Design a protein around this ligand. Structure first.
Ligand code: IYL
Ligand code: CL
Length: 293
């Protein structure tokens, strides 16, 4: 059965006046592997993937500011806030060159950091990642009216902040296999208090859909422009039917993006880590062995 525990010792670092929590396992020398989660998850989403990589490589998995075991400042939790705190996190750990393993909103953070710091990125493994969604027709039909309602300050905040729907409903609807009560309690833990749910609502309001917000659309277009030409080694995981990346898109990207290998994980929606963690971790471990790190 897929593991439900989170055995990792807590590590904390002060970042811009705030304490950020991170997993830090594996050997201390060599190039580290930095794991970035998205909405509404935490380093918990990497718990069954990291044990495949940690025998041979350092694994660092931070909880984004306002999420997981990290501190909860009184912020808007805009994408720009996450960019500021992640930039500062990476410098606080003194990381030099890295391999990135990134997912969904963590993929926007990772690709935006890689585009700005390409000399420091030796490879990117990614899955269910953020690209511009040009019209609402390109958002999955089964989740279209709900994400449209999320992108409002009235209904959207009622659902996500008052009623915790991103945790109770959107999260399980992002996994094909059923989540256990223990797993759901791990995802619920950072957000038991409704006043702490601001990141859960601002994230879907930042998604680059139908041209808004224009500033995020532009930023995401920029790192996609880079990714289509950069020689950086790329490993793309995808599932069927997917959410942000449908199978036909994954197959086109595997051909268009330079130096990109694609791996079919089988059934999957958004949190591919919850549907086939052993294939994702074992393929990352094999792919790392082919990099000059
Ligand atoms: C308390 N209260 C008002 C509600 C309301 C609605 C529900 C809903 C629910 C959910 C939705 C809903 O979230 N759709 C969007 C799905 O997007 C999936 C793809 O993105 C993944 C993340 C991508 C991130 C990218 O960055 C719609 C409609 C409903 C409904 O029932 O009306 C629940 C659904 C499932 C459930 N259990 C335990 C399995 C329990 C549910 O419980 C509910 C409770
Ligand atoms: Cl989101």
């Amino acid at each position: 059965g897929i593991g439900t525990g989170f055995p990792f010792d807590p590590h904390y670092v002060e970042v811009l006046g705030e304490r950020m929590h991170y997993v830090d396992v594996g050997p201390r020398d060599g190039t580290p592997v930095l794991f970035l989660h998205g909405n509404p998850t935490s380093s918990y989403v990497w718990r069954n993937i990291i044990p495949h990589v940690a025998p041979t490589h350092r694994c660092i998995a931070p909880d984004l500011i306002g999420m997981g075991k990290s501190d909860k400042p009184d912020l808007g939790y805009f994408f720009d806030d996450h960019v500021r705190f992640m930039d500062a996190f990476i410098e606080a750990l003194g990381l030099e060159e890295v391999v990135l393993v990134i997912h969904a909103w963590g993929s926007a953070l990772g690709f935006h950091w890689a585009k700005r710091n390409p000399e420091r990125v030796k490879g990117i493994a990614f899955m269910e990642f953020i690209r511009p969604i040009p019209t609402w027709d390109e958002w999955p039909e089964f989740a279209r009216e709900t994400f449209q309602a999320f992108r409002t300050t009235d209904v959207g905040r009622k659902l996500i902040i008052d009623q915790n729907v991103f945790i109770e409903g959107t999260l399980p609807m992002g996994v094909v296999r059923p989540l256990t009560e223990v797993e759901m309690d791990h995802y619920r833990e950072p957000f038991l208090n409704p006043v702490d749910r601001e990141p859960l609502w601002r994230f879907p309001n930042e998604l680059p859909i139908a041209g808004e917000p224009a500033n995020i659309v532009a930023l995401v277009e920029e790192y996609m422009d880079w990714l289509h030409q950069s020689p950086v080694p790329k490993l793309l995981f995808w599932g069927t039917p997917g959410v942000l990346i449908p199978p036909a898109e994954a197959a086109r990207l595997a051909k268009s993006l330079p130096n990109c290998k694609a791996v079919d994980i089988g059934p999957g929606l958004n949190l591919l880590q919850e549907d086939n963690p052993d294939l994702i971790g074992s393929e990352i471990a094999r792919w790392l062995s082919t990099l000059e790190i």
